Every structure is written in C-alpha cells, then in structure tokens.
Scaffold this active site. Structure first.
Site, PDB file in Angstrom:
ATOM      1  CB  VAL A 105      -6.167   3.669   1.629  1.00 60.83           C
ATOM      2  CG1 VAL A 105      -5.565   3.936   3.226  1.00 60.83           C
ATOM      3  CG2 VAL A 105      -6.815   2.376   1.616  1.00 60.83           C
ATOM      4  CB  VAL A 107      -9.818   0.239  -0.226  1.00 62.59           C
ATOM      5  CG1 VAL A 107      -8.943  -0.357   0.783  1.00 62.59           C
ATOM      6  CG2 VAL A 107     -10.480  -0.444  -1.257  1.00 62.59           C
ATOM      7  CG  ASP A 123      -8.335  -6.173 -12.268  1.00 57.09           C
ATOM      8  OD1 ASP A 123      -8.054  -5.681 -13.304  1.00 57.09           O
ATOM      9  OD2 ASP A 123      -9.083  -5.516 -11.337  1.00 57.09           O
TER      10      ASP A 123
HETATM   11  O1  LIG Z   1      -3.683  -2.723   2.361  1.00 60.65           O
HETATM   12  C1  LIG Z   1      -4.364  -2.496   1.539  1.00 60.65           C
HETATM   13  C2  LIG Z   1      -5.475  -3.329   1.115  1.00 60.65           C
HETATM   14  C3  LIG Z   1      -6.256  -3.266   0.110  1.00 60.65           C
HETATM   15  C4  LIG Z   1      -7.263  -4.359  -0.465  1.00 60.65           C
HETATM   16  C5  LIG Z   1      -8.075  -3.924  -1.550  1.00 60.65           C
HETATM   17  C6  LIG Z   1      -8.906  -4.730  -1.956  1.00 60.65           C
HETATM   18  C7  LIG Z   1      -8.950  -6.160  -1.618  1.00 60.65           C
HETATM   19  O2  LIG Z   1      -9.849  -6.918  -1.893  1.00 60.65           O
HETATM   20  C8  LIG Z   1      -8.197  -6.423  -0.728  1.00 60.65           C
HETATM   21  C9  LIG Z   1      -7.304  -5.492   0.243  1.00 60.65           C
HETATM   22  O3  LIG Z   1      -6.175  -2.110  -0.604  1.00 60.65           O
HETATM   23  C10 LIG Z   1      -5.271  -1.178  -0.449  1.00 60.65           C
HETATM   24  C11 LIG Z   1      -5.162  -0.044  -1.111  1.00 60.65           C
HETATM   25  C12 LIG Z   1      -4.208   1.151  -0.843  1.00 60.65           C
HETATM   26  O4  LIG Z   1      -4.432   2.164  -1.755  1.00 60.65           O
HETATM   27  C13 LIG Z   1      -3.790   1.041   0.313  1.00 60.65           C
HETATM   28  C14 LIG Z   1      -3.600  -0.189   0.875  1.00 60.65           C
HETATM   29  O5  LIG Z   1      -2.633  -0.253   2.019  1.00 60.65           O
HETATM   30  C15 LIG Z   1      -4.578  -1.216   0.886  1.00 60.65           C
END
Ligand SMILES: O=c1cc(-c2ccc(O)cc2)oc2cc(O)cc(O)c12
Length: 326
Positions: free
Chosen positions: A39, A47, A150
């Site tokens: 994603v 991720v 950030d």
């Molecule tokens: O549900 C999501 C969660 C995260 C995420 C990304 C970094 C974190 O420290 C915690 C959660 O990234 C995402 C990036 C996306 O492009 C889409 C997502 O649904 C998510």
C-alpha cells in the site's frame, strides 16, 4: 527557548516512560500476519495491507528498512506510550524474520483514501472536521510529552466512509525535554518550520503546528504543497516571500540567530503577502474569514507565537464541529 505548554511531562514521569534505549522488545509471531498487498513506502519502510491469520481481521504490516537499534526502540516506545490515545494509530504487535532479523510493526488497518484524490472532494465542513480530528491526535501526543515531527498529509490516514482519522508514522517522533537541542533534519521539506530552516535546535511541539498550518493552507487554497521549495534554502525563501522578511528579522533577533550569508542573500527582502491573495475561483468556497484567522495563527515564524493544539481546537473556525460532538 522552551515549550509554553506540557514542558514538564517527561520530568514528572518515571525514567522508564521516556528512556526508550532501555526498552527490551517482546517479539510476537511473524507467522500470525500475512502480506496481502503493498500500500505504501518511504525512505524508512514499506507498508502492506495484511491479514491476521488467527482472527482473519485486516492489519497493516510495516516492514522496516535497515535501521539502528536506537531509532527502532524510539518509534516502538512512542507507539506503546500513545496506544489508545485519540486518533493515534494502534500498534498491535512487533515481529521479525528469524533469518535476517528484519523487524515488522503490525498496526490496526485503516481503509485509507490517498490525500491527492481525497482532499479535492472534501467539503468546507469535512476540512474542518478532519483538521479537528488531527488536532485531537496532536494535543494528545503533546500532552504525553511527544513531538511527531513529520506532520504531512502522507501521514494522516482517513477512512472517509467511517469518518475515521489516524495519525501514522511515528518514526521521526521524539520525546520533548526542556532545553534539549534536536536534529533539524526532521519533517518533510514542504512542512519544515522556520526553526528547522534557520537551525534553531531547541524547538518544541509547536513545530507540529507549523506543519499543520502548511497542510491546512494546502487544503483551503488548493495549492499542494503550499510552500514549494526545491531544497532547504529555497524552502525558507518560499516562506519569506509569503510572510515577509521584516517578520523574519524580528524572529532571528529574538532568538539571536544569524543566517548563513548564502541563505541571507537568497532570502533577500520581501513584503508580506496577505492571505487573501491566494484566493481564486477554485478555492473560494473554502477561504472564509475564520479559516484565514485560524491559518494566520498557525503560520507564524515565531514558534512561541503559534496556537497550541488545545487552543486551535477552541478556535471559532471549528464551532460547528464542536457543536456536533456536543
Ligand atoms: O492503514 C494504513 C496504515 C499505515 C501505517 C504506516 C506507517 C505507520 O507507522 C503506521 C501505519 O500506512 C498506510 C499507508 C497507505 O498507503 C494506506 C493505508 O491504509 C495505511
């Protein structure tokens, strides 16, 4: 310089709260979580949408790129400290590959819509709503002694159907300690506060409020990113061309900072450009006097002058959002 609110948080709390290097990670089972699809990605991670094979619920698997022990413990400790706070992403598990020791962080899943496609569909009311929800997360993390460092739309997950927002990616986040000098190589260029750009190292939670102001200006004026510098010097130039250099000079004098002669020359001298000059036919329905008043109170050179997150939430701009909640 010192934070005007929450400056004593880490002082009153036992060392275990903020001493993240003393953390010992209890690792879960890597096998519990299967990758379904990629994603997202950045300099420090990739991720994936995942599945918890036990309960078959969705999750996010954040696979960390080669990182130093200290830095991974910092992100983990902050996530654990903040778990359960309003609109903070929930860290659910921490796992690693046995062979390579590559760590993954496991999070709740948010059915996100990317800001580049989401934000242009948002009504005036939705912008107020989502900015308010983001302010809840920021007041909470600041109240717990943590600066995010950030804030940007890439780090704000929104399930627009459930009207659910989560502030994610705590990998650049830090504990605030009065008098401490911090690395200024934090935050994404377009969202870096003047403090970062002029090398003021004893910054605080107010850095996040500058970043929020940038995000907000981008939303209401439909100019993304709002301050669009090509490098860190150019970033200060872009800001100065909006806020004016007269304001910049008073700031520099107050905290006794001198710019590098190269930077000074690039910045030159600039008149203040009033906020209404960014108004056009496309953004018109979003740029009301309350929006402008609110924005103006975030985008100040002087970090000590910016609204705190708690103050921002009480601004009359959000009165309809508050009333709905009450
Ligand atoms: O549900 C999501 C969660 C995260 C995420 C990304 C970094 C974190 O420290 C915690 C959660 O990234 C995402 C990036 C996306 O492009 C889409 C997502 O649904 C998510």
């Amino acid at each position: 310089s010192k934070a005007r609110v929450y400056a004593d948080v880490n002082v009153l709390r036992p060392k275990e709260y903020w001493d993240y290097e003393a953390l010992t990670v209890q690792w879960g089972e890597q096998d519990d979580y299967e990758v379904v699809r990629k994603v997202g990605r950045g300099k420090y991670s990739e991720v994936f949408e995942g599945i918890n094979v036990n309960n078959n619920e969705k999750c996010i698997i954040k696979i960390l790129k080669p990182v130093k022990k200290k830095k991974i413990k910092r992100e983990i400790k902050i996530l654990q400290n903040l778990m359960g706070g309003p609109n903070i992403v929930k860290l659910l598990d921490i796992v690693r590959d046995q062979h390579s020791k590559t760590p993954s962080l496991i999070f709740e899943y948010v059915n996100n819509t990317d800001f580049k496609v989401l934000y242009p569909t948002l009504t005036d009311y939705d912008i107020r709503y989502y900015i308010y929800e983001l302010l809840k997360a920021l007041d909470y993390c600041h109240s717990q002694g943590i600066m995010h460092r950030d804030v940007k739309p890439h780090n704000v997950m929104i399930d627009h159907e459930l009207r659910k927002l989560r502030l994610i990616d705590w990998g650049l986040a830090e504990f605030y300690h009065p008098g401490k000098e911090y690395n200024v190589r934090v935050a994404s260029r377009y969202f870096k506060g003047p403090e970062l750009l002029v090398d003021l190292q004893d910054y605080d939670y107010s850095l996040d409020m500058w970043s929020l102001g940038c995000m907000f200006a981008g939303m209401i004026f439909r100019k993304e990113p709002f301050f669009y510098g090509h490098d860190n010097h150019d970033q200060l130039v872009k800001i100065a061309k909006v806020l004016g250099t007269d304001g910049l000079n008073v700031y520099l004098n107050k905290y006794r900072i001198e710019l590098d002669p190269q930077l000074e020359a690039l910045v030159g001298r600039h008149s203040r450009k009033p906020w209404l000059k960014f108004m056009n036919a496309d953004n018109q329905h979003l740029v009301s006097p309350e929006a402008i008043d609110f924005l103006d109170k975030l985008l100040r050179y002087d970090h000590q002058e910016r609204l705190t997150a708690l103050e921002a939430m009480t601004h009359p701009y959000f009165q309809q959002v508050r009333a709905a909640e009450n």
